[PDB]
Amino acid sequence: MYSFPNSFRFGWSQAGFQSEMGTPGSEDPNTDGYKWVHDPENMAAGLVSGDLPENGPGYWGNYKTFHDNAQKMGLKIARLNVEWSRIFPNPLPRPFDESKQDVTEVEINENELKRLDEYANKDALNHYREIFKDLKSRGLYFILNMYHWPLPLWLHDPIRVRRGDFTGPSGWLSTRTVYEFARFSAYIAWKFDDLVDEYSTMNEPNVVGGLGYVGVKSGFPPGYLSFELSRRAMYNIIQAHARAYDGIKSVSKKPVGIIYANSSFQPLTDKDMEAVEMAENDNRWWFFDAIIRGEITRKIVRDDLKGRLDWIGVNYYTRTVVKRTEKGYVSLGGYGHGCERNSVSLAGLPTSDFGWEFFPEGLYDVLTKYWNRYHLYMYVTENGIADDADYQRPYYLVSHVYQVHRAINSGADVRGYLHWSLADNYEWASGFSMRFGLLKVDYNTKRLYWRPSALVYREIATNGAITDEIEHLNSVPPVKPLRH
Ligand SMILES: c1ccc2[nH]ccc2c1
Ligand SMILES: [Cl-]
Ligand SMILES: [Cl-]
Ligand SMILES: [Cl-]
Incomplete structure (x- = not known):
């Protein structure tokens, strides 16, 4: 068996925009994201699927x-997160x-908090x-995240920005957003600290900057292709984190962290280690060196x-596979998140339903890398697989949990594993x-079913271990029986 410390917790992560809507009174039309996924031009271009969040799993009610x-x-x-848009529409x-x-x-004081309170829903x-x-009544330990991508529409009209009009609310391209986000965070800690x-x-602040302004085929708002603006957004998102940290700490003594989208960078050949670095x-490192060491350019x-x-x-x-090139490095298609769906790399x-390669060793790499550089404790806040059939998820789950065990064994302070998603x-x-669920949702009825992986996870969580019986x-x- 692979046993975990008695304080180590297994659980899950979830986001508001992705899970809240689907039940009566739950619709939140007041975000950039809602506008973005309803936009007729985005739908016609195939930038968004045409599926609408208000038809979702209904956590708000269920x-x-x-x-x-x-x-x-x-x-x-x-x-879980609060949606800014719900509190300040x-x-x-x-x-x-x-x-x-x-x-x-960004100054926080009691009078200012009380004035903000007058505007809150x-x-x-x-x-x-x-x-x-x-x-909390289920005995669950609670990590509250302030921001998981959608912004209030009054801070960001993403269709205007997509169109190249920068005269309106421009999201992370504006320091106004930085200012208001710091105040929003302090306010939420003030209200919910108990x-x-x-x-x-x-x-995943890196996704906001990276996909919003560079990886524009991804359908992430505002889809305006610009290296310069990607940098501006990231610079602002970095100071917004620091001002939110200070804001929360002005009203709370509890730990404040950040959650980031990681990949394990792996060399195509033994000559490519410089590419990995x-x-x-x-x-x-550029991002964490900024918010940990204060180092910016x-x-x-x-x-x-x-x-x-x-x-x-x-x-x-x-993972992401990379190779050294003349001008630096490049990532390679056919590995990592750039594979065909339901195939082999x-x-x-x-590969998963999303085309993402099975590579649990990368989680050990990422955990130990962060530990060795900063020696700050960690949670695995997301890890999961697109797999409606549940063919791969039992292996995916156990394999990645094992790698967290390995990381702890190597000395890394990892305090929990949160699957994406319940x-x-x-x-x-x-x-x-x-x-991505351990539980399958029927969107017509909002009914939840247990995939067999959910039964596997119950064995892990209830025993605080990968037990002997599921170590295989x-x-x-096995790839032979899968599509390839
Ligand atoms: C669709 C896709 C990506 C997104 N990021 C924020 C809102 C939103 C909607
Ligand atoms: Cl990373
Ligand atoms: Cl450090
Ligand atoms: Cl369905």
């Missing part, structure tokens, strides 16, 4: 049933020098309190950025077709 299943599954931790008065590039301080706040109270165990400011610098240290992190949330799905490893949900531009699942799904 949370007790989600929690009942998690409780029966033995889960002991959950990571309406424009706040303009505050503050918008032309100023750096935001080094009380029905939404109360409803989140009811959800989170129910969660229920929360740990905080994260944001989820470059890829890690360019996708990972203008190369300088910003005292207002340094030390703004207590823990690191690792989201890991697959160029390495002969099976139930199927709205997978952004791909819609409902990509099914620490292996690659």
Whole structure:
């Protein structure tokens, strides 16, 4: 058996936009994301699937049933977010020098919190309190994340930006967003600190910058192709994290971390290790060096950025294979997240419904890399597979959990494993077709079914271990019987 520390917790992660809607009174039309996925031109271009989030799994209304299943599954931790748009659906008065590039301080005080409170949607706040109270009543440890991609529409009209009009609300391209996000985070900690165990400011900030302004075929708003603006968005998202960290800490003593989209960079050949290091610098270290060490390029240290992190949330799905080139490195198709769907990679490893390669060793790589560089504790905040049939997920689950065990054995302080996700949900531009749940959702009835992987996870969580009887699942799904 592979046993975990007695304090180690198994659980799940979930996002508001992806899981909340689907039940009466739940629709939130007030985000960039809602506008984006409903846009007729985006649908005609195939940038978004045409599936609509309001037809989703209905956590807003059915949370007790989600929690009942998690409780029966033995889960002991959950990571969820509040949707900013639900709490502040309406424009706040303009505050503050918008032309100023750096935001080094956003003042928080009781009077300001009380004034913000006057603008908050009380029905939404109360409803989140009811959800989170129910969660805590299952004995679940609670990580509250402030931001998981959609912005209030009054801060970002993504169709205007897509069209190249920068005269309106421009999301992360504006320091106004940075300012308001810091205030929003402090406010949420002020209101919910009694229920929360740990905080994260944001989820996968690198995806917001990278897919929103470079990987524009992905269908991530605002889909405006610009290297320069991608950089501007990331610079702002970095100071927004630091100002949110300071804001939460002005009202709470609890740990504040961040959750990031990771890949394990792997060499095509034994001559490509320099490519790996470059890829890690360019996708990972530049960002964390900024919020941990204060190191940014203008190369300088910003005292207002340094030390703004207590823990690191690792989201890991697959590797990225890279090779050294004249001008630096390139990633290779046919491996990692760039494979055909339901096939095999160029390495002969099976791929998921999303075309993502089976590569659990990469999770050990990422955990140990972060540990060795920063020595901050971690949670695995996402790990999962698109697999409606459940053919690969039993192996995927056990294999990746084993690698977390290996990482802990090697010395890394990893305090939990949160699967993505408890139930199927709205997978952004791909819609409902990509099914990541331990529980399968029938979207017509909102009914939840247990995939056999859910029974496997119950064995792991309830025993706090990969037990002897399921250790054979620490292996690659047999490829012969799968499509290839
Ligand atoms: C669809 C796809 C990606 C997204 N990011 C934020 C909202 C949203 C909607
Ligand atoms: Cl990474
Ligand atoms: Cl350090
Ligand atoms: Cl369905």
